[PDB]
């Protein structure tokens, strides 16, 4: 159901089996690289990503030692890494913002199953875009994902209010409440959470 949907929750504890299956998953995790909201490496490994898709793509933002740990998670969750997007960070005039200064952010692209009917090869694997507010991912990624898999259901983990999008369900503990419009999801949510509380 096309309009934006979201669930404020601790993603460690939400039963994601109520959300159904998704053509695309995106995650921008608070890797332990500790600061508020961080997940330990074990908590990351244990996320029930495998129930979220049968055939489709996973987009996983990584930095520092999560370039390696994110590969471990992707493989443990059942994905093969088949691309790596980089976002070249620029100012409003298109100039680039330990051993080297860092001009880019990285997003691994994993595949699970054997997706059919996606539009692979429409976009390239380099994003050039302005840092529109620190710590945000560039909005361009939603466009590339929509051209890749138009009209399908998508789910974002560890998103924020600015991330909510049509065709997407956004999960994160800084969202405002619970806003669900898909009847399949609404039905399974009330069944699983009759009193609206998501604990343990």
């Amino acid at each position: 159901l096309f309009p934006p949907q979201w669930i404020c929750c601790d993603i460690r504890y939400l039963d994601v089996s109520i959300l159904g299956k998704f053509a695309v998953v995106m995650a921008d995790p608070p890797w332990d690289i500790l600061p508020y909201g961080t997940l330990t490496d074990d908590e990351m490994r244990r996320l029930n990503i495998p129930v979220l898709q049968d055939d489709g793509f996973l987009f996983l933002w990584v930095t520092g030692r999560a370039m390696e740990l994110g590969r471990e998670c992707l493989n443990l969750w059942g994905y093969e890494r088949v691309d790596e997007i980089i976002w070249v960070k620029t100012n409003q005039l298109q100039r680039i913002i330990h051993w080297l200064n860092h001009g880019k952010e990285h997003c691994l692209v994993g595949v699970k199953g054997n997706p059919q009917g996606f539009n692979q090869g429409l976009d390239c694997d380099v994003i050039v875009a302005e840092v529109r507010s620190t710590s945000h991912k560039p909005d361009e990624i939603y466009g590339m994902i929509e051209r890749l898999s138009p009209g399908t259901r998508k789910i974002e983990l560890f998103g924020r209010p600015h991330n909510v999008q049509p065709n997407w369900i956004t999960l994160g503990n800084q969202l405002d409440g619970i806003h669900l419009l898909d009847p399949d999801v609404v039905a399974r949510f009330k069944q699983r959470y009759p009193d609206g509380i998501i604990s343990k």
Partner: protein, 240 residues
Amino acid sequence: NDYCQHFVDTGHRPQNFIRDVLIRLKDELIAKSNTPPMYLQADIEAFDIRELTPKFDVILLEPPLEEYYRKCWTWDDIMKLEIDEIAAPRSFIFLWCGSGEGLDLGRVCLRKWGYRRCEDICWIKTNKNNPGLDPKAVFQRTKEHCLMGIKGTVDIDLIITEEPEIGNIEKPVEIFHIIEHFCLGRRRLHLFGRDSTIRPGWLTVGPTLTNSNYNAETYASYFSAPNSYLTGCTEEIERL
């Protein structure tokens, strides 16, 4: 503007629109301390890499991957290179990994040889001159990765050039500039270099070299005392 949509509309890669892409004395110091270029033709698959002495401070490894071509080395071949046998206990590696499975297998190699990855240097290829396909790919691949690894106790991680003509496998010479600016020491090895990559300050070993001048005793004499620990960015040690 959305340069991704623009690429979909026009075939111009988003990197085509990046613009503008006191160190000179340091480049001069590098040039002053560079050893003479030295080079050896050797079939690396049949060659006992331990004959390469002494142990190196920097290794640049550029195996000819199949994806570079519209004798190729598989990651099976590369992984079985015994790089840890010629790397100094404190030393650095720069591994060109391409754009596909090498991004994973190259990391397996680094760990196999005792390195941890400390940077990921991306060569972004523009197509300004020709605006506008691996079966696994989700996106058009417009870059290559050079992983930097470290073992033991000014520049950006991007190189931007126009995509070379088909059949040209050369990597951007800018990678040498980045490596030399780190001032990591003077024993520098380029495995799978070519006549076209030979460079002062570097020992180049590769199968297609047409000539050799490598002599292990002569090479070691460049780093004998008092010169054993120079960074390659400091002034020569006065003799006579």
